[PDB]
Design a protein around this nucleic acid. Structure first.
Ligand code: DTP
Ligand code: MN
Ligand code: ZN
Length: 1028
DNA sequence: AAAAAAAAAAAACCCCCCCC
DNA sequence: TTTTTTTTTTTT
DNA sequence: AAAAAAAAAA
RNA sequence: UUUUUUUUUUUU
């Protein structure tokens, strides 16, 4: 039983201070020059573990002191009664039993109330409860049925255990000592070498600021390593741990020896989805490292990520910051299309996946690669230190296995493992790119050979009968030195051949199974014929979404919960599909997706709130609603950003097939329009992107051709037949846009650097640039204030969050007129609401309470969600419009909520409660029903209390919506007490107690003063707060 | 000539919260 | 009464 | 410019 | 039940 740190223990103030004092005292009394700092850090970890155990035991003992004394007294009195029975002893025993039972009941009630409060704070939001409700039951780590060596099913725990441990020990024991072959392979091919500056950047001395940056970036709510310390321990005791962690890492840099804890890790076997559980090779051995080892490896990973852009080509986008997965997906789709349009089809596209990508990678080959990449000195010495004697023990069925060495492979679950694996696999990538014998597919003026995402490598070949053989020979050579293994049972290949004999020979020699219809690549069904992309990618997407809706039909969550479910689960999948393949989708797809989503949201019933109302911003609603057409436009127009940027790493841009003006995509945005050129007959992604960008620009009624962000390289300047050296000079000196050099009277005059730039340009081109720039049309078209749409694609140098900004701008642009239900409320009371009243009602809807249940109730009240006798009488085309619950009056919404003689006494009680709170609030239905206040009620010190009372009243009114019995004050008070308990524990957990007490103390005291003792005891209503 | 916006007509299902 | 779907008109 | 959560890929 | 990259949503 390995100890683990409980995060709730770190939130205790006394334990916090005691543990900080212990850390400081120990680490200033045990620090000396008679011992190394690695063993000192290990001893510090052991001492912290022991002190934490002692503190937890002390806390448990103190928390149960009163009950322990009571139970001791009860047992003693019971023994005395058994020996000699007395009446007073019986009375004392009964009283002690009653007190003990009351204390235990209070403790359990507090526990369940804390749990209910935590759930109620995130009842319908995008959070762990909703995702857990979506997901199936959590799979336990109890693997009990696994194939043995002799081919028979076994269930004996000892045999199961020994089979797993022996298999994984064998997996991590095969270390190759053929150093000469590795050196030869590295020397054969050319690899990048870091210069002196980058090497000194890697080997720079560690600073405490790096420790803080890494500690703050550590993910929370993650399982601790074998040492049992969580990331929260390092984040919370950060102030006293950065100096000693920094000194330990300095000792590591001077000596190169790591603490013994840095090596030990625990391997947890997750079953791989879509694979057979009973197979022992079908488990992913992730490793939980100590958070300090994770800190060191994350420092190292950041240091190498500083230069990962130079170390690794742009063909590889897995684990590489700043490049998306669809970079390779669109590129492969374009290559497939180019093959399909090829008159002679002699191409192959092999999707190769590495079997156990960096579980079979070689540490010696990795070290040799790092040496060959210029990585040497302190950084490489630390890298060699962390791979010196790795050791992992499998945590199997909750039992720690005896540890085995990691003589081979790279530990999974390590911050540095992806970067090092990418570095090692880049040797093979550059070998493939640099081997002229294997031929890539010549798309336009560029050659395309390979694209990588982690170990998912796709190779495009021409003349495959020799290219595939040479690629296999190269991969075998790489395997002989690095242990890289091809996952034959997952690797596939599209083989385009017009000769049956050559094709049959290729399947005869090639081990890859030739996919005839589709290849699953990064969750995307790459198609052999590119016209099948919609039918093999989006029709399955609709089928999957329909199945998920059918599975969630009986889910126990409301319409807000279902909207957030669609956002949390369905929406990312749709967005990923749109990003990977932004092909022109038929409107049938969007209508079907919207119908499925809306049927899911409203439980296959009629929509209570119009989808046009929810599709607006959160102002009209407060929870909004996904717009899949607008999201599709956002993803398809995001390519405009990559067009404008015109980066050298965007190969997926240039592989689009084209016959007229091949270099056109960089000259389309904020650039002169074509002369009705019929470019892009059959392009798949870029033509639709351009059409949608132009449509959006037309919708904005803005000129997208001559823009303040028009480049100097743009066709506007190029068509002047100016020398490209002038464009280079203007880009280097002044800037990249026309504004940077000025137009009109501002032509090369706003900056003294313009005078120097003028001397570097030919006078003919200077004259022509002056003539173009000082023209009236150019001056008015360029010297104008840019819009948000233009700023999205031009002023942002990073592609992070392009979809969100573009989608928000599109939701602003495509805003649709909707019928405001607040105006219907105004018509209901025969009174007029101003713009200020509408804003107040919408804001009250937005932030009546933090919890989404209270907000959902307020939204349903204000947005006329509830069903009424008048409305239902209309739907059934009957005449039963009489109010429910029985009054003889017409059942409008204002009647059901406010004016009914049955609900009216509840509102009179609410107003009495308001009255003894010294609140003079007018008897206006708008005040509770929508939160609309008179203009003179500017004071907000009573807003929250009134909101709580009114919304609890709405809750208890909806509780008995058509019930002939009238809503009562007691149920309203019970709902208020439930809300009070929830917000009390929420404030206790979220450190927001003062504001909660400010808006809940007087109301609670009046509740207690207006309730009898019998009601308080029966309904469990009592004060949770004191005098503070 | 095709895409997008707007207006008119029809159909809905007499509770509503709660439900981790 | 309110929402959705269809349809007819207008504009690029 | 922060935090939290979810999801996709590996 | 870990790691990297990316994406979105919500709260400011
Ligand atoms: N859930 C995960 N947690 C941690 N690391 C992961 C996870 N999924 C994938 N990886 C990392 C480690 C793998 O070596 C690497 C490549 O993933 P992947 O190709 O799916 O599997 P794999 O190469 O480990 O084995 P196999 O190809 O036999 O399924 O990505
Ligand atoms: Mn793999
Ligand atoms: Zn009534």
């Amino acid at each position: 039983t390995t100890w683990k740190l409980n995060n709730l223990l770190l939130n205790d103030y006394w334990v916090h201070n005691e543990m900080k004092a212990e850390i400081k005292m120990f680490f200033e009394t045990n620090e000396n020059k008679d011992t190394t700092y690695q063993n000192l850090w290990d001893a510090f970890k052991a001492v912290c573990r022991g002190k934490f155990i002692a503190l937890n035991a002390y806390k448990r003992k103190q928390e149960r002191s009163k009950i322990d004394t009571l139970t001791s007294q009860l047992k003693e009195l019971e023994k005395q009664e058994q020996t000699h029975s007395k009446a007073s002893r019986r009375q004392e025993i009964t009283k002690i039993r009653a007190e003990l039972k009351e204390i235990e009941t209070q403790k359990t009630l507090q526990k369940i109330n804390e749990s209910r409060s935590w759930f109620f704070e995130r009842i319908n939001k995008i959070d762990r409860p909703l995702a857990r409700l979506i997901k199936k039951k959590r799979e336990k780590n109890q693997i009990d049925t696994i194939k043995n060596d002799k081919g028979d099913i076994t269930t004996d725990p000892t045999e199961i255990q020994t089979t797993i441990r022996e298999y994984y020990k064998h997996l991590y024991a095969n270390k190759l000592e053929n150093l000469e072959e590795m050196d030869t392979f590295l020397d054969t091919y050319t690899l990048p070498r870091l210069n002196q500056e980058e090497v000194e950047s890697l080997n720079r001395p560690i600073t405490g600021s790096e420790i803080v940056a890494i500690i703050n970036s550590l993910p929370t709510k993650k399982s601790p390593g074998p040492d049992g310390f969580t990331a929260e321990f390092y984040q919370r005791y950060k102030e006293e741990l950065v100096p000693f962690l920094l000194k330990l890492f300095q000792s590591i840099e001077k000596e190169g020896i790591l603490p013994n804890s840095f090596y030990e890790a625990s391997i947890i076997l997750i079953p791989k989805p879509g694979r057979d559980t009973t197979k022992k090779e079908n488990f992913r051995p992730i490793s939980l490292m100590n958070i300090d080892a994770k800190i060191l490896n994350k420092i190292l990973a950041n240091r190498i990520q500083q230069h990962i852009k130079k170390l690794i080509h742009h063909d590889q986008v897995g684990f590489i910051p700043g490049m998306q997965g669809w970079f390779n997906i669109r590129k492969s789709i374009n290559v497939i299309q180019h093959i399909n349009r090829a008159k002679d089809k002699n191409h192959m596209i092999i999707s190769i996946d590495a079997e156990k990508a960096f579980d079979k990678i070689q540490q010696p080959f990795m070290l040799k690669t790092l040496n060959k990449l210029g990585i040497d000195g302190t950084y490489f010495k630390i890298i060699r230190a962390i791979y010196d004697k790795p050791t992992a023990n499998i945590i199997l069925n909750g039992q720690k296995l005896e540890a085995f060495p990691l003589k081979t492979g790279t530990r999974q679950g390590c911050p540095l493992s992806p970067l090092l694996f990418n570095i090692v696999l880049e040797v093979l990538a550059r070998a493939i790119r640099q081997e002229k014998e294997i031929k890539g597919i010549q798309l336009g003026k560029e050659e395309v050979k390979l694209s990588l995402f982690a170990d998912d490598m796709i190779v495009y070949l021409e003349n495959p009968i020799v290219s595939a053989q040479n690629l296999l020979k190269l991969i075998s050579n790489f395997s002989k030195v690095s242990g890289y293994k091809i996952n034959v049972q997952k690797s596939q290949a599209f083989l385009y051949t017009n000769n049956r004999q050559t094709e049959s020979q290729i399947m005869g020699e090639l081990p890859f199974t030739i996919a005839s219809k589709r290849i699953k690549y990064l969750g995307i069904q790459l198609t052999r014929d590119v016209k099948d992309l919609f039918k093999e990618n989006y029709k399955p997407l609709l089928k999957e979404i329909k199945e998920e809706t059918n599975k969630w039909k009986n889910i126990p969550c409301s319409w807000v919960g279902r909207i957030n479910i669609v956002k949390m689960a369905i929406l990312p999948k749709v967005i990923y599909r749109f990003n990977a393949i932004p092909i022109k989708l038929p409107m049938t797809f969007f209508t079907e997706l919207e119908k499925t989503t809306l049927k899911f949201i409203w439980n296959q019933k009629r929509a209570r709130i119009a989808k046009s109302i929810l599709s607006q911003k959160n102002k009209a609603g407060g929870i909004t609603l996904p717009d899949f057409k607008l999201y599709y436009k956002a993803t398809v127009t995001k390519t405009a950003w990559y067009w404008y940027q015109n980066r050298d790493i965007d190969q997926w841009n240039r592989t689009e097939p084209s016959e007229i003006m091949p270099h056109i995509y960089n000259y389309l945005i904020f650039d002169k329009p074509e002369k009705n050129k019929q470019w892009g007959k059959d392009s798949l992604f870029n033509k639709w992107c351009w059409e949608n960008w132009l449509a959006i620009c037309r919708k904005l009624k803005l000129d997208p051709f001559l823009t303040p962000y028009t480049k100097i390289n743009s066709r506007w300047i190029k068509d002047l037949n100016v020398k490209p050296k002038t464009i280079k000079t203007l880009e280097e000196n002044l800037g990249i846009t026309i504004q940077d050099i000025g137009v009109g009277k501002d032509f090369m005059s706003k900056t003294p650097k313009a005078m120097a730039t003028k001397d570097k340009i030919d006078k003919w081109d200077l004259i022509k640039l002056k003539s173009f720039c000082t023209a009236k049309e150019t001056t008015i078209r360029v010297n104008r204030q840019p819009t948000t749409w233009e700023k999205i694609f031009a002023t942002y140098s990073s592609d992070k969050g392009l979809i969100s900004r573009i989608y928000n701008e599109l939701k602003q642009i495509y805003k649709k007129k909707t019928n405001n239900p607040i105006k219907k409320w105004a018509k209901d009371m025969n009174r007029h609401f101003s713009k200020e009243d509408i804003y107040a009602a919408k804001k009250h809807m937005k932030k009546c309470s933090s919890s989404l249940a209270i907000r959902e109730m307020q939204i349903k009240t204000t947005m006329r969600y509830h069903l009424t006798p008048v409305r239902m009488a209309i739907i059934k085309k009957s005449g039963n419009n009489r109010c429910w619950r029985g009054c003889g009056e017409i059942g409008t919404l204002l009647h059901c909520w406010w004016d009914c003689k049955l609900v009216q006494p509840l509102w009179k009680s609410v107003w009495r409660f308001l009255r003894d709170l010294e609140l003079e609030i007018p008897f206006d239905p708008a005040i509770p029903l929508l939160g609309i206040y008179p203009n003179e009620y500017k004071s907000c010190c009573y807003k929250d209390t009134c909101t709580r009372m009114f919304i609890a009243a709405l809750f208890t009114i909806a509780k008995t919506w058509n019930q002939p019995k009238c809503p009562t004050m007691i149920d309203w008070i019970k709902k208020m007490w439930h809300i009070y308990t929830m917000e009390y524990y929420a404030a206790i957990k979220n450190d927001e107690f003062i504001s909660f007490v400010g808006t809940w103390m007087k109301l609670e005291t009046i509740i207690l003063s207006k309730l009898s003792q019998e009601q308080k005891t029966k309904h469990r209503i009592f004060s949770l707060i004191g005098g503070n």
